[PDB]
Design a protein around this ligand. Sequence first.
Ligand SMILES: C[n+]1cn([C@@H]2O[C@H](COP(=O)(O)OP(=O)(O)O)[C@@H](O)[C@H]2O)c2nc(N)[nH]c(=O)c21
Length: 213
Amino acid sequence: MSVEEVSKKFEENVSVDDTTATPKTVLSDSAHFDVKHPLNTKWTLWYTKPAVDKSESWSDLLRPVTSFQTVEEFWAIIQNIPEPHELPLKSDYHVFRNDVRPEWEDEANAKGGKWSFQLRGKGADIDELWLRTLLAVIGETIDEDDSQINGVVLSIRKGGNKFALWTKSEDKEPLLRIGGKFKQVLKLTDDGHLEFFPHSSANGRHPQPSITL
Ligand SMILES: C[n+]1cn([C@@H]2O[C@H](COP(=O)(O)OP(=O)(O)O)[C@@H](O)[C@H]2O)c2nc(N)[nH]c(=O)c21
């Protein structure tokens, strides 16, 4: 049947009196201190190889997979080093979960924006350094980025690599600042080429995005 005592314990007023609940905790556990593979966030791994969506479906190509809180897995997609000008270009990798993670169609819905960077000059080893910065930004206890952002993405094209950074809402202010740096990490210079667009682009780009080098 349904039976419940009648005592109730309402006596935990500690708004500004420090957490006196020292000996009384719900879970005194905090491993953390990893940085050896497992970071501290959840991020799925959806990468797109083909592009037959023309007749198939952008969702029929994109392969959603590896969803962990470490770096070994993400490093795996890089282990193939197909991004640094090693694959059939037109590539598109995506990993995230912090605040959103539905897809470029809603990852912007996350309430952040989509920073892209179209590279032309070939370096043969640029997608490895820019990735270590994206895959690490997810968490890697880096702070100052794995919390204000929501997810990242990567995509190559005919002689035109293109990466994507999906913020969670940090505001374009800190983006025009980050994008600027992330724009150089690509090791470019021909014209600081790059693209700045808020979710408003993946859902009705009525207003203006940000810029496009
Ligand atoms: C990431 N993403 C890409 N596409 C489509 O895939 C096409 C890619 O064409 P593109 O802009 O030349 O990039 P790519 O060929 O290197 O991928 C675009 O026209 C997009 O509309 C997508 N379409 C949907 N619905 N959702 C997504 O998340 C998504």
